[PDB]
Design a protein around this ligand. Structure first.
Ligand SMILES: *[C@@H](CC(=O)NNc1cnccn1)n1cnc(-c2cc(C(F)(F)F)cc(C(F)(F)F)c2)n1
Length: 912
């Protein structure tokens, strides 16, 4: 039978609404199950209004069979088929006939059909129309009356699911789905009925009970429902906490919802230390895409619920915590979840209320800590307390004494030997310093000297046990702390003391190399240089422009080291082969080179005085890098060279234009040959290459007129290869570069005319080739813009030269028959008059980009329809725009609700 199903599937793929526009349903008039399975298969071959009215033929027979047949397998199959086709069957059939009553009385109460029957009702609940309001109300009230008998509220759904059979678990899931969907789409319908409120409480009670099922999927469904309900009630009246109607109706059970939320809170990402299944405390090692989304939903729900009632949230939390300190419920799981909840509602709340809540929370946590002696408990408590103080910079910035105590204890934790406590401490140290910079540098109340100095004077001891990654983390934190010091005369000394330890190591290594360069081949020396350069990169990332004070100190030695490592690795590769790059020592040297380039790129991207950058830093970099990049084989070419060139060109523009020819002489031709041959070989080099090309085109276009034309040929060839590419991102970048290049070249007279005569027809031919080929339909707007631009330039007469070399002819007419011939070649079946009309319209629309786009799209769509080809992807950008608009709207809404985003996530950093 499988072969028949596959053959029918393939036949359906061959344009069902054209080749087979439902007739087989007649055969069901013992065989009905075969029909139902066939349509079940068809239900996924279907992806608007695909002649959907003929689904009524399915529904009529389904009602007939449903109303009259007792064959349980057949009933199940028919119910499944209807479950699929409720997405399209006309509404005037489902809501008018005996359907709802028929299955709610005849099947929903029967185990053989319970799950499918409830799923069918879920799909009916999924219909979202203002019509049939009374039928929806009847559906919900009757379904509740049924499932009340079938699953009484007194049942402990947690236990029933945990020990329940597979079908029972599926029934619990389907009940959750039905309740969630129906209340989402019709709660206002139910709430408007005074007498039904008790049944609404029954639904809410079911939601509470089913929310306690452990399995992640069930709780995800319940959480989505709770998120919807909380959002709706919050938006009913978000400014206060008399009660509005809906909130008044839901309040009698909101408390249980908050208790559920706090009890079951998922792990935040910032918590590195977790309890392992074997009963021990360890650092986290894996992540799940489910966890992040579940945590985000959990945070949304709980922040909405807190906005609904602040006092009650405080009460709940403070009581759970008072309980766990008392030892009534002491357990790492409970404390972890409670502290995750305490940190998750960070923000929101209010200022004085947050202070009041956190004072008691910190007191209770400290006492709990001071009571538990076991090392595992001491780690769990420390981790949780770190998470709390990490998520509440608002509290810290108002209490200097506590902030200093937290920082000192965090340093004490940095020495703690436990697996993940050090990482927790350093990550929290960033989260503190980043969001509380000014307090560290400004002399606070009572103290004599800024806290940054107590850090720097003891930095070596503070970093006397850290893993190198944690060392870079800590240096980045200190970098943020210094970065806020506005006084340059003090910031320079702070930087010098700040960098003093790695600068000492650097000076030692440089002195050793000067005495003998062979030291650079020692793996330990290379590793230390890599660590120092990573520290410098992170410090530059933090401090920003003032980092030049440190950078200029070591710049020349850094480039000398780069040259020495370049020579070493190049000689090694030349002597022993390309695979030499795989050796750990060679990889470490390449890491040193990569970090040098990254440091320069990082500093330049934040520099604000391009003149001095061009004068001092650029020429040594070019001398040290370009020849190496040209000479090395692909296996040893650093893509960070291209990235740095992109960044430097972007920042400097006209100040570096004179150097562009050399850069292209060294890089361009060498790198291009690596990209073209095989697409996947060097994705990073490809990306950095097109970044460089876009930057130089945008900010240093005159360079293209300086380089020899034989190489500008390669530039245009690379751009054309770029937009003809298959992958979306590279094609988009190619189109952007092409359009910018046209705009730029339009401004230089002789260059404009020569470029037109040499390439205009080639570029147009390639653009129409890609458009007709449709291989990159997503960029059709850019294609329309480019085509319109060229059509305008020719139409306005700005192309003074005759495009045809051999024929004295008008440019407009010439381009007209040229594009007509091109279109005819692409699609030989097009008629002459059709193409003539299309080209005349297209030319007439050169002045209006949206109109041009829609004209071209309509022409291409009718070509597809002649070919019978799918037109869905030809509107892909529009649908993508819709998705982006929806996402941006959601983001816009979330920022309006305090607490949904972490204090370390909002761009709107409050003062201090
Ligand atoms: C409790 C253990 C402790 O802090 N001190 N025990 C002593 C004191 N004197 C002599 C002998 N033993 N404990 C565990 N964790 C914390 C704690 C952690 C943090 C954080 F920054 F790491 F999150 C901060 C603080 C605070 F509130 F700043 F004190 C305490 N305390």
């Amino acid at each position: 039978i499988g072969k028949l199903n596959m053959i029918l599937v393939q036949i359906l793929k061959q344009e069902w609404p054209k080749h087979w526009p439902i007739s087989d349903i007649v055969g069901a008039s013992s065989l009905c199950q075969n029909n139902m399975v066939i349509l079940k298969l068809l239900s996924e071959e279907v992806f608007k209004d695909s002649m959907c009215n003929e689904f009524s033929q399915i529904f009529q027979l389904c009602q007939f069979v449903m109303e009259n047949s007792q064959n349980a397998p057949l009933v199940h199959a028919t119910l499944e088929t209807l479950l699929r086709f409720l997405n399209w069957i006309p509404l005037g059939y489902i809501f008018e006939t005996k359907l709802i009553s028929t299955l709610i009385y005849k099947f929903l109460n029967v185990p053989m059909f319970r799950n499918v029957s409830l799923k069918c009702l879920t799909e009916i609940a999924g219909v979202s129309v203002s019509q049939y309001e009374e039928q929806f109300v009847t559906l919900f009230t009757l379904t509740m009356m049924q499932l009340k008998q079938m699953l009484p509220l007194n049942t402990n759904i947690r236990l029933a699911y945990s020990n329940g059979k597979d079908d029972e678990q599926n029934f619990i899931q389907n009940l959750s789905l039905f309740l969630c969907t129906f209340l989402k789409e019709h709660d206002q319908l139910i709430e408007k009925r005074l007498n039904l409120r008790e049944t609404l409480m029954e639904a809410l009670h079911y939601m509470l009970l089913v929310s306690e099922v452990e399995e992640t999927e069930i709780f995800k469904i319940c959480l989505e429902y709770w998120n919807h309900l909380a959002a709706e009630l919050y938006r009913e009246s978000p400014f206060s906490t008399d009660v509005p109607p809906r909130r008044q109706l839901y309040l009698p059970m909101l408390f249980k919802v908050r208790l559920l939320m706090v009890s079951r809170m998922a792990k935040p990402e910032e918590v590195l230390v977790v309890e392992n299944d074997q009963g021990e405390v360890v650092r986290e090692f894996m992540k799940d895409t489910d966890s992040i989304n579940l945590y985000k939903n959990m945070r949304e729900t709980l922040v909405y619920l807190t906005h609904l009632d602040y006092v009650d949230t405080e009460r709940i939390m403070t009581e759970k915590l008072h309980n766990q300190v008392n030892g009534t419920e002491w357990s790492w799981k409970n404390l972890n979840t409670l502290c995750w909840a305490i940190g998750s509602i960070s923000g929101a709340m209010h200022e004085e209320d947050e202070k009041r809540f956190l004072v008691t929370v910190i007191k209770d946590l400290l006492g709990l800590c001071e009571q538990k002696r076991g090392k595992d408990n001491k780690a769990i408590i420390a981790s949780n307390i770190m998470y709390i103080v990490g998520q509440y910079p608002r509290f810290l910035r108002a209490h200097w004494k506590f902030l200093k105590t937290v920082v000192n204890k965090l340093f004490e934790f940095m020495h703690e030997t436990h697996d993940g406590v050090q990482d927790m401490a350093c990550d929290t140290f960033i989260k503190i310093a980043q969001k509380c910079r000014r307090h560290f540098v400004q002399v606070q109340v009572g103290e004599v000297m800024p806290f940054i100095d107590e850090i720097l004077n003891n930095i070596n001891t503070i970093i006397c046990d850290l893993q190198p990654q944690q060392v870079h983390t800590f240096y980045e934190a200190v970098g943020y702390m210094i970065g806020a010091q506005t006084d340059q005369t003090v910031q320079e000394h702070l930087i010098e003391k700040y960098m003093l330890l790695p600068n000492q190591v650097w000076d030692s290594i440089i002195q050793q190399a000067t005495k003998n360069v062979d030291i650079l081949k020692d793996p330990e020396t290379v590793k230390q240089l890599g660590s120092i350069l990573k520290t410098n990169v992170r410090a530059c990332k933090a401090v920003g422009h003032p980092f030049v004070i440190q950078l200029g100190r070591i710049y020349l030695d850094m480039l000398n080291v780069y040259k020495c490592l370049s020579e070493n690795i190049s000689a090694a590769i030349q002597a022993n082969g390309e695979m030499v790059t795989k050796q750990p020592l060679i990889r470490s040297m390449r890491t040193v080179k990569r970090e040098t380039l990254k440091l320069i790129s990082g500093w330049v991207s934040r520099s604000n005085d391009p003149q001095m950058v061009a004068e001092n830093f650029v020429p040594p970099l070019l001398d040290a890098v370009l020849i190496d990049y040209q000479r090395n084989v692909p296996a040893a070419r650093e893509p960070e060279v291209l990235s740095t060139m992109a960044i430097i060109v972007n920042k400097l523009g006209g100040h570096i234009t004179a150097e562009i020819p050399q850069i292209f002489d060294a890089v361009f031709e060498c790198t291009l040959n690596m990209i073209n041959k095989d697409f996947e070989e060097y994705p990073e080099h490809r990306t950095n290459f097109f970044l460089l090309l876009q930057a130089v085109n945008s900010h240093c276009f005159p360079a293209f007129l300086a380089i020899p034309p034989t190489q500008f040929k390669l530039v245009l060839d690379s751009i054309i290869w770029a937009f003809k590419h298959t992958m979306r991102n590279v094609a988009d970048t190619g189109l952007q570069i092409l359009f910018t290049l046209l705009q730029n070249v339009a401004q230089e007279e002789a260059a404009a005319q020569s470029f037109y005569q040499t390439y205009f027809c080639d570029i147009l031919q390639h653009i129409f080739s890609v458009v007709t080929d449709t291989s990159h339909t997503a960029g059709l707007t850019m294609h329309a813009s480019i085509l319109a631009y060229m059509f305008n330039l020719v139409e306005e007469g700005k192309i003074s030269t005759s495009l045809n070399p051999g024929n004295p002819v008008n440019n407009q007419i010439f381009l007209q028959e040229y594009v007509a011939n091109l279109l005819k070649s692409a699609f030989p079946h097009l008629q002459d008059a059709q193409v003539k009309l299309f080209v005349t319209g297209l030319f007439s629309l050169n002045q209006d980009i949206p109109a041009f786009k829609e004209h071209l799209r309509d022409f291409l769509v009718q070509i597809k329809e002649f070919a019978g080809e799918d037109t869905s992807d030809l509107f892909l950008e529009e649908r993508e725009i819709a998705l982006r608009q929806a996402d941006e709207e959601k983001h816009k809404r979330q920022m309006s609700v305090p607490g949904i985003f972490n204090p370390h996530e909002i761009p709107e950093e409050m003062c201090d």
